[PDB]
Design an enzyme around this catalytic site. Sequence first.
Site, short mmCIF file in Angstrom:
data_model
loop_
_atom_site.label_atom_id
_atom_site.label_comp_id
_atom_site.label_asym_id
_atom_site.label_seq_id
_atom_site.Cartn_x
_atom_site.Cartn_y
_atom_site.Cartn_z
N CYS A 1 0.85 -1.18 0.00
CA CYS A 1 0.00 0.00 0.00
C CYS A 1 0.89 1.23 0.00
O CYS A 1 1.50 1.55 1.01
CB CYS A 1 -0.92 -0.01 1.22
SG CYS A 1 -1.88 1.51 1.56
N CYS B 1 -0.20 4.18 2.19
CA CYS B 1 0.09 3.88 3.59
C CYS B 1 1.48 4.35 4.00
O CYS B 1 1.67 4.76 5.15
CB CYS B 1 -0.05 2.39 3.89
SG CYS B 1 -1.72 1.75 3.61
#
Length: 106
Positions: free
Chosen positions: A30, A33
Amino acid sequence: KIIHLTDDSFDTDVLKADGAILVDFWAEWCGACKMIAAILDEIADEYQGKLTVAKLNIDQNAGTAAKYGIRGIATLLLFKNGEVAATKVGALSKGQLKEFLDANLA
């Protein structure tokens, strides 16, 4: 001072917590993230005393991620008294996170 969360500890650490808690829902695969991870420690330090920052890896803790409909996307939820007070999905800058916190904290 960032709290490490698990499905097992979420109730005690977040829902039964005193004070506002910022929970970062994240996963390894991700990219957004990582942009959020990059700014959390500074934020934790700047808001010490009126906020606690916590992280939940959603690959390892699918139970809680499901409960809040995270659906694999970088998500910040601000908790107060066991309830979601505010929500931010996706990447954001140091400036946008400060805005988010200032707009939603006392």
